[PDB]
Design a protein around this nucleic acid. Structure first.
Ligand SMILES: CCCCCCCC/C=C\CCCCCCCC(=O)O[C@@H](COC(=O)CCCCCCCCCCCCCCC)COP(=O)([O-])OCC[N+](C)(C)C
Ligand SMILES: CCCCCCCC/C=C\CCCCCCCC(=O)O[C@@H](COC(=O)CCCCCCCCCCCCCCC)COP(=O)([O-])OCC[N+](C)(C)C
Ligand SMILES: CC(C)CCC[C@@H](C)[C@H]1CC[C@H]2[C@@H]3CC=C4C[C@@H](O)CC[C@]4(C)[C@H]3CC[C@]12C
Ligand SMILES: CC(C)CCC[C@@H](C)[C@H]1CC[C@H]2[C@@H]3CC=C4C[C@@H](O)CC[C@]4(C)[C@H]3CC[C@]12C
Ligand SMILES: CC(C)CCC[C@@H](C)[C@H]1CC[C@H]2[C@@H]3CC=C4C[C@@H](O)CC[C@]4(C)[C@H]3CC[C@]12C
Ligand SMILES: CC(C)CCC[C@@H](C)[C@H]1CC[C@H]2[C@@H]3CC=C4C[C@@H](O)CC[C@]4(C)[C@H]3CC[C@]12C
Ligand SMILES: CC(C)CCC[C@@H](C)[C@H]1CC[C@H]2[C@@H]3CC=C4C[C@@H](O)CC[C@]4(C)[C@H]3CC[C@]12C
Ligand SMILES: CC(C)CCC[C@@H](C)[C@H]1CC[C@H]2[C@@H]3CC=C4C[C@@H](O)CC[C@]4(C)[C@H]3CC[C@]12C
Ligand SMILES: CC(C)CCC[C@@H](C)[C@H]1CC[C@H]2[C@@H]3CC=C4C[C@@H](O)CC[C@]4(C)[C@H]3CC[C@]12C
Ligand SMILES: CC(C)CCC[C@@H](C)[C@H]1CC[C@H]2[C@@H]3CC=C4C[C@@H](O)CC[C@]4(C)[C@H]3CC[C@]12C
Ligand SMILES: CC(=O)N[C@@H]1[C@@H](O)[C@H](O)[C@@H](CO)O[C@H]1O
Ligand SMILES: CC(=O)N[C@@H]1[C@@H](O)[C@H](O)[C@@H](CO)O[C@H]1O
Ligand SMILES: [Zn+2]
Ligand SMILES: [Zn+2]
Lengths: 660, 660
RNA sequence: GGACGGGCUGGGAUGACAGAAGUCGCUUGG
RNA sequence: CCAAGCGACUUCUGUCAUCCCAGCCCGUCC
RNA sequence: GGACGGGCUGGGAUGACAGAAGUCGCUUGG
RNA sequence: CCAAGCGACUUCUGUCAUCCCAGCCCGUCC
């Protein structure tokens, strides 16, 4: 004997059953003629009677497959964290037309005939006979090499393709040949079977870590169940110019869920594909409409404060103004920008989670709408700062001025715009979320303003303590999000803070029946109702509780201040009533749009990727964009109301001003 | 013909030369008898006359190698960023004794004889004859499987092993068999050829990305030239219990340097190995000696301030004290801890850079000495805070009290301890270094104290502006470190700050000849000398310039204050003179030990790993640990001096106190 | 008579690593 | 017509590890 | 007479994908 | 003695792509 056995297999052979005698090697050869051009070939190996090898450790059977141009290795059994399968298969890069010689037309029978070989080798380390099974199946060039676009055709669609642990799928994309500068791919599935979407440059391998020391990350691995999205940017298309796309089913649903119990590692999944060619877009109409909508609100500032300004030691305040309050947002922005710029193109589709049903790209930014919709905060914060500085300028009549604290509120509105724009570059699970804590700070600052407005000029050191508390609460909620008692910690902290506020009110104002008793009663009832609401509903997500509580407390205290003004035989101007009504309406709308967020970092990446909320307006504005815009509007209206409410006391002597 | 040719090769054959005819496959078989147990086999393939294939793209020759237990693929030519080699080789996992049957003794000739096969397959997609070369070499079980320790033997050493792109090296480590709970490996090389150190669990592969979707990081890839260190912790040894270690030469020195011009991708490198078994250590003697040394300094506080305390609206100050100054350090610490805990064992040896010649481990911490040597800052900051609060307590005689600013100084000493301890968990190239900015803040706060001590009580809003400036400078230096004009930006900012300080002095004190003119002259000369020093020396590293400038300016201003006290016919107590002399000496020693840092993130990872500074004292304290300890001592002495210098004016009326 | 553990003793076939003798191929420049 | 690096086996000394095993003896359970 | 580009026309060998007919192996529970 | 999922080819309709090519003609450079 020779220990090496050579077998000639036909092209019609799809299933091969053979017995590997001890210490023997099987070589199987299939001749590939010209009909195998651009045919994606899959080879799978299975061990017959795997129960006889349960006491054996390591690889029991080795299979090598090669067609001359590409190759791979099959090692059985394959070990995954949950299970061990005695079957596995891989894909082979198809042969091209250049592999069969130069014209292939007019075979006048003159130069030699050239063929290609598919070679399969089977080996084992066991000193015993093993029965194995081989599956040799192909995908033709009608389904592989499917991405060919006609003139005027920018979208192609596939539908309902079976997929299994034994039947992977693959596509070839040639951007240079098809004149594609931007490409987007979407996958749709109605069942919840875990699968993987793989994208690689056409000159790279998905199986071989081609060099010992690579550390290059050009391979995309996106686990998905219902939806997956990949976006090829101009930079990536210029860098690589050609790509291969693969979809593989995962043997176990452990990277996609926690409990589905599918029961048989080989199931079928139906997937529909969407291939679209994109071009650079300047969203002129939606941006112009958004700016127009954000502009006419400011017609309330013009007739009063700007007209007053027209009719009309600083160094000891600049050096003592707290400038360290801007630091956390700036460090977070720097860290996020560094993480974004040092990441590769492939990693940006894996580490970031956008609502791709309402994401409009711009260059490398996946969701330009979620970034540009933050301009209202910047505009209103700049207006607040400039107005407060200009409106400065007396000490006997009227309510105490609040210039520095209004400047702080404007500064934090600008910081909110910056932080929310930074967050939407790449939303992920990080130590500091920083999507809406500046709104909490703004609400607290408004509460502080109305608290101290009738005793003195409010100071921005309350900003220091408030910011420390807000950042600590954000970090604590982020760190305990995976546990089951985070909401109880939130409730305990909430109760402590509310009790401290009520005690401070009781000490500052005194125990009069009408003023402090009803304040404490209403505040405690409202906060207890909120705590009951977010403890036993499961409809309130973790990232919304703090913002909702801060907004509710700010609104309640503002309403209390207005009621106290009315009850003390004072007059609220109809302009202030209009500003308050607009603030209430805007806050209600912003909260309604904020509730539709549905963000949860405790679930799997596939569960996150399965979000399918489409745009609401002009194919550009979603629920989150409207939340940004209406939150900015609500902040503006609240600022105008607090600036304008005490206008009836402008001539009243400071000694005769009621305190509450 | 059959297109498949089977060749029987002998064990003596080390070099095989053959011609691959067009559309033919070569199968080469070598029988492996029992003598091949634990023999590490290397197979390399070379294309003869590679100049004939310069117009061909993709893989020209495919080689598969397998011994039944392990396999790999060779695809030629291999493409690296700088060059294309038409030769490559890989390593094969050796066969074990279980692969040849059960006793192998007393062959009474009664059951079958079992052998193993080494199979090599050669294929090509070209329609032309190719000449190729095969190298089959082995490493015996005397060098592979070298890590076997006798009784009482904790260290083994290898020396001067040749290594090439064609002769990789490898070792097997069995922690369970050898009773190893902690393991450390060091590599020494005298030449600067780039190489790679690979560590993998014994059931994993270094070549195959075993599952489509892995994302597991258990493979260590450390590029090195002169030195490399890997540390196996108890957690890793428990998780995996067996490891394989490999060293490969890189074809191009592009991941190790920028300009060496070696000229021939195949050169030899001499490497010496060091294998040591470690046990958990409690460094009782060095820690006790350090604490004793840090304790007796505090005998200066006892006779005066504590004796005074023994002889002896707050809410309006707690709510206005700037608490946002603690935020940047706390967020940096949280981010670093999250990055540390979510990292795998293998990644911690790649992403972190310690001075391994002076790193003492404790659990998973690689350099426990660099962390525990920060306790002096914590102790002295707590002492400063407690002393300042207790010493409070009148308004007509003496210098204005500075309780809140001393509390701030103590708080920032504690923050410095926290930030420096956090930095030494994993020193890397990040957006915010945060190793010594709190020292800069402390120096600035001392300057502010001595600036405002004779006009009013210093306020901690100067802390806000100072911290914003320090953090901005740190980030700016970090972001422009790779350029060639960062020091010019530093010099421009330095000049601006010095000019602003001089102008503020001129405005505050007035243009008298003796006081302000010489102050401006000396300050400008000193800062210009410093700027000239760090602009044209290259001995001052980027991460030291800001700290050195802040320390120098603080010392200069303190000396100026003392000289002004002496010149104004005042008396400095001998105790204050002793405190000042000790502060100067401690600052000099701390600066001397700080200069020996030699940290530069602009160089390659191998250049960073080639640092070999050993411990100076007790095998535990290096230059950096002494820098920590003496910086804490210098801060303590400076604080005592500023607290005690104006003791001669305790009874002097505040109206008769000179201002300077 | 089973036994592989027992030192010892010597032989054997080697295998691979470090330090020392003359033969190929790939590189350039004049 | 020069000088390198690498590669292979003609063969010299430490070595480090394999097994084929040579014998009697101390030797306990068969 | 070279020419592969030219539609058309029909045949051929198919190959692979989606939707419809009865055959193996692996899973359990009673 | 039950019910699933998968796998293979007996064969039915859209299809999608390959080449073997069948002919004359419009046809320009040989
Ligand atoms: C570790 C984890 C984080 C922990 C913290 C987490 C929360 C961090 C948030 C906030 C922390 C800071 C809040 C204030 C602290 C108490 C101060 C106080 O009551 O006294 C002050 C009152 O001043 C006010 O009460 C002003 C309004 C406060 C707005 C902020 C609270 C928002 C409520 C959010 C709703 C619940 C939060 C949402 C929960 C999901 C001043 O006292 P005084 O005596 O009047 O002044 C003395 C001078 N005088 C007497 C002469 C006038
Ligand atoms: C964007 C990138 C970062 C940019 C910033 C980077 C640096 C950030 C660092 C620092 C920024 C902050 C420094 C102070 C700012 C000027 C204030 C001033 O002069 O006036 C104050 C003086 O008070 C002092 O001068 C106190 C001492 C200052 C200590 C800090 C400087 C350290 C020098 C570091 C050496 C160079 C740094 C190292 C370079 C490698 C007060 O003014 P006044 O008029 O007296 O008060 C009015 C009231 N009165 C008149 C009634 C009394
Ligand atoms: C200042 C107020 C109005 C908000 C700022 C809006 C302006 C400055 C923004 C909004 C939309 C933006 C544009 C959106 C799309 C394009 C097309 C592309 O070439 C990138 C830049 C460019 C040209 C942007 C330039 C800046 C832009 C015009
Ligand atoms: C502020 C109120 C009063 C007016 C509203 C401003 C609107 C109409 C303006 C302001 C800035 C403008 C943008 C400025 C520049 C660009 C880039 C150009 O390539 C396409 C149009 C586009 C994107 C404009 C769209 C319209 C735009 C958003
Ligand atoms: C959140 C902020 C902006 C809203 C402030 C709106 C102000 C103007 C509104 C909200 C609550 C209102 C009060 C609610 C209830 C009553 C009781 C009744 O006797 C009529 C007047 C009075 C006393 C209202 C006066 C106007 C009022 C104070
Ligand atoms: C003054 C604001 C900020 C505080 C209270 C916010 C109010 C307006 C918000 C917060 C909770 C919201 C509700 C939450 C749940 C539901 C059920 C579902 O059909 C969506 C809308 C609806 C009916 C929302 C309507 C608007 C809502 C009541
Ligand atoms: C408070 C002052 C004295 C500084 C604090 C020093 C003390 C608390 C530190 C310094 C050295 C430390 C020890 C160093 C080593 C060991 C051995 C091991 O089992 C881990 C914990 C343990 C036991 C540490 C416990 C804490 C420790 C004793
Ligand atoms: C503070 C001055 C006055 C005294 C110096 C304190 C020294 C001697 C003390 C303080 C805390 C002590 C440590 C406390 C606990 C442990 C853990 C134990 O498993 C080994 C000893 C060790 C590591 C001690 C070493 C000595 C130590 C560092
Ligand atoms: C950095 C801090 C802690 C050091 C302060 C040390 C003090 C005590 C020292 C440092 C510089 C010294 C001065 C340096 C020069 C002179 C000039 C001469 O006429 C003697 C006294 C006098 C005026 C010294 C007095 C003491 C002095 C002020
Ligand atoms: C008062 C302090 C903080 C400011 C000045 C620091 C002094 C003491 C430091 C900073 C620069 C240092 C010098 C820098 C360079 C050299 C050359 C070499 O042989 C090492 C030591 C030596 C000779 C150092 C001695 C100490 C040194 C002069
Ligand atoms: C696939 C496609 O339609 N691409 C067209 C191609 O026909 C044309 O030759 C070229 C220049 O117009 O690129 C474009
Ligand atoms: C390699 C080594 O010395 N390990 C020793 C081994 O001899 C002993 O049997 C066991 C328990 O003491 O572990 C230890
Ligand atoms: Zn947002
Ligand atoms: Zn340090």
């Amino acid at each position: 004997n020779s220990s090496v056995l050579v077998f000639e297999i036909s092209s019609k052979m799809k299933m091969i059953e053979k017995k590997l005698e001890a210490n023997t090697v099987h070589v199987l050869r299939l001749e590939l003629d010209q009909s195998f051009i651009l045919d994606l070939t899959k080879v799978a190996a299975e061990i017959v009677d795997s129960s006889k090898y349960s006491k054996e450790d390591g690889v029991i059977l080795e299979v090598t497959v090669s067609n001359g141009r590409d190759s791979f290795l099959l090692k059985l059994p394959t070990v995954y964290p949950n299970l061990k399968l005695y079957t596995d298969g891989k894909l082979l890069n198809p042969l091209v037309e250049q592999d069969f010689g130069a014209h292939r037309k007019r075979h006048r029978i003159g130069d030699p005939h050239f063929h290609q070989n598919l070679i399969v080798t089977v080996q084992s380390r066991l000193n015993a006979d093993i029965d194995y099974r081989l599956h040799v199946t192909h995908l033709d060039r009608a389904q592989y090499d499917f991405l060919k676009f006609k003139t005027g055709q920018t979208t192609k669609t596939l539908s309902n393709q079976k997929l299994t642990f034994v039947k992977p799928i693959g596509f070839f994309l040639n951007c240079s040949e098809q004149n594609i500068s931007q490409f987007h791919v979407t996958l749709y599935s109605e069942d919840d079977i875990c699968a993987n979407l793989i994208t690689v440059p056409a000159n790279e391998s998905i199986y071989d870590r081609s060099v010992i020391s690579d550390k290059t990350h050009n391979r995309r691995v996106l686990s998905f169940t219902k939806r997956a999205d990949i976006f090829f940017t101009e930079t990536e298309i210029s860098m690589f110019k050609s790509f291969r796309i693969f979809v593989f089913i995962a043997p176990d649903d452990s990277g996609c869920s926690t409990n589905t119990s599918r029961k048989s590692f080989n199931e079928k999944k139906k997937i529909s594909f969407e291939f679209k060619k994109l071009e650079n877009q300047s969203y002129a109409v939606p941006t112009a409409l958004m700016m127009i909508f954000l502009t006419t609100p400011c017609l309330l500032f013009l007739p009063i404060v700007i007209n007053i300004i027209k009719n009309s030691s600083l160094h000891g305040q600049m050096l003592q103004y707290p400038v360290a309050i801007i630091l956390p947002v700036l460090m977070h922005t720097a860290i996020e920008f560094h993480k974004w710029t040092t990441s590769t193109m492939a990693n940006r589709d894996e580490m970031c989670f956008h609502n791709h049903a309402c994401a409009r790209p711009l260059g490398e930014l996946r969701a330009w709408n979620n970034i540009i919709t933050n301009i209202g905060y910047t505009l209103y914060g700049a207006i607040f700062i400039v107005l407060s500085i200009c409106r400065r300028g007396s000490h006997v009549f009227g309510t105490y001025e609040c210039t520095l604290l209004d400047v702080t509120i404007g500064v934090f509105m600008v910081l909110q715009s910056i932080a929310s724009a930074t967050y939407h570059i790449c939303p992920s699970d990080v130590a500091f979320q920083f999507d809406t804590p500046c709104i909490q700070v703004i609400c607290g600052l408004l509460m502080v303003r109305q608290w101290f407005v009738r005793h003195e000029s409010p100071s921005p050191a309350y900003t220091n303590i408030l910011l420390v508390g807000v950042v600590s609460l954000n970090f604590l909620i982020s760190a305990f999000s995976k546990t089951s008692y985070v909401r109880f910690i939130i409730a305990v902290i909430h109760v402590i803070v509310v009790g401290s506020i009520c005690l401070a009110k009781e000490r500052s104002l005194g125990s009069e029946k009408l003023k402090t008793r009803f304040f404490i009663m209403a505040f405690s009832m409202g906060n207890f109702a909120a705590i009951v609401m977010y403890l036993t509903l499961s409809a309130f997500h973790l990232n919304q509780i703090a913002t909702y509580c801060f907004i509710i407390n700010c609104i309640m205290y503002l309403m209390y201040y207005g009621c106290m003004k009315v009850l003390h035989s004072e007059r609220i101007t109809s302009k202030a009533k209009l500003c308050g009504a607009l603030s209430l309406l805007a806050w209600a709308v912003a909260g309604f749009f904020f509730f539709q967020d549905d963000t949860d970092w405790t679930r799997s990446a596939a569960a996150s990727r399965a979000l399918n909320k489409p745009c609401l307006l002009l194919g550009f504005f979603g629920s989150h964009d409207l939340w940004h815009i209406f939150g900015a509007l609500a902040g503006l209206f609240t600022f105008i109301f607090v600036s304008f409410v005490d206008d009836d006391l402008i001539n009243t002597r400071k000694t005769s001003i009621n305190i509450f």
